[PDB]
Amino acid sequence: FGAWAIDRLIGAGGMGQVYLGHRREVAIKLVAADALDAQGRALFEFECRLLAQMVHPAIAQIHDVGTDAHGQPYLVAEYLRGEPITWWCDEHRLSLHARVLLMLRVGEAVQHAHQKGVIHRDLKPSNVLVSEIDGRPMPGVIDFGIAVDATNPGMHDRGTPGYMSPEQARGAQDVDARSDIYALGAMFYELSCGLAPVAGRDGVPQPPSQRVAAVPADARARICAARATTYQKLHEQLRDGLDAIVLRALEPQPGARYASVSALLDDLHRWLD
Numbered sequence: 001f002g003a004w005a006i007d008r009l010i011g012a013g014g015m016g017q018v019y020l021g022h023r024r025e026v027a028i029k030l031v032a033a034d035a036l037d038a039q040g041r042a043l044f045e046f047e048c049r050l051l052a053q054m055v056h057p058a059i060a061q062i063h064d065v066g067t068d069a070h071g072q073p074y075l076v077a078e079y080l081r082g083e084p085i086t087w088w089c090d091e092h093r094l095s096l097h098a099r100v101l102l103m104l105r106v107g108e109a110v111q112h113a114h115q116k117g118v119i120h121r122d123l124k125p126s127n128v129l130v131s132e133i134d135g136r137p138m139p140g141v142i143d144f145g146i147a148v149d150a151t152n153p154g155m156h157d158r159g160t161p162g163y164m165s166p167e168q169a170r171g172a173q174d175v176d177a178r179s180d181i182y183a184l185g186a187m188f189y190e191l192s193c194g195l196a197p198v199a200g201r202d203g204v205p206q207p208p209s210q211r212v213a214a215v216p217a218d219a220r221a222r223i224c225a226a227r228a229t230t231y232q233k234l235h236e237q238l239r240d241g242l243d244a245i246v247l248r249a250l251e252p253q254p255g256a257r258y259a260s261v262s263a264l265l266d267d268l269h270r271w272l273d
């Protein structure tokens with residue numbers, strides 16, 4: 001496949017596959033040939049350009065973009081070793097404080113993409129990988145959405161309930177940076193209390209503190225061990241500000257949410273300080 005050579009499959013979308021490859025280990029994303037019309041293909045090339053311009057340690061470089069000999073659009077990107085952020089933090093038993101530091105780093109990568117006019121649209125643990133580099137947990141944000149609104153509509157869909165914003169779930173036209181903010185909120189909720197956000201009748205989850213308070217003692221013990229804390233300290237630290245921050249990010253109305261990932265970061269730093 002060009003200067004690049006497929007090793008194994010690592011993902012599928014029904015309208016695209018991702019493979020592990022190599023010249024440097026790469027990801028090679030193939031797009032189904034009938035998924036993008038002339039306009040979608042234009043939009044795809046442009047957004048691929050925008051992505052290629054990002055220079056941030058937490059975002060994969062873009063090596064190549066083209067169309068294969070089967071009519072499929074492709075991109076080659078850096079392959080990032082790592083594990084889903086939530087799973088990684090549990091395995092290495094990070095404190096809330098170390099988790100929030102990683103949240104800042106993830107937020108800084110998403111904020112860098114927003115500033116270059118790029119919105120991810122599918123943030124979730126499997127697209128936010130962590131490894132240890134020079135002793136520190138360092139995140140990698142992968143698999144940005146490209147030309148998602150231009151896809152052949154003749155083709156359980158879209159993103160993941162819980163992470164995807166209500167607007168995206170209602171198939172809305174105006175999906176903006178605030179949708180990534182919602183998804184960060186949902187990820188940060190899980191990092192904080194070890195339980196998924198479940199939107200209740202008013203489209204808002206319980207505060208993390210109340211969520212972990214309701215679960216049985218065995219679930220409670222596991223969550224607290226994975227954060228190197230007692231239940232009572234976990235409950236208090238969440239109540240101290242992480243509840244408010246994650247709930248602001250998870251406001252069902254975009255207008256009531258953080259207006260920017262920059263505003264979310266400021267509140268995370270105020271909690272740490």
Ligand SMILES: O=c1[nH]c2ccc(Cl)cc2c(N[C@@H]2CN3CCC2CC3)c1-c1nc2ccccc2[nH]1
Nearest residue numbers: 010011018027029077078079080081082126142143
């Ligand atoms: O860089 C990667 N590293 C990984 C490491 C481990 C595993 Cl299991 C998957 C990926 C992985 N696939 C994810 C695993 N899962 C399915 C595909 C992808 C998102 C969630 C990517 C990746 N880099 C990409 C760059 C551009 C486009 C796609 C990309 N995928």
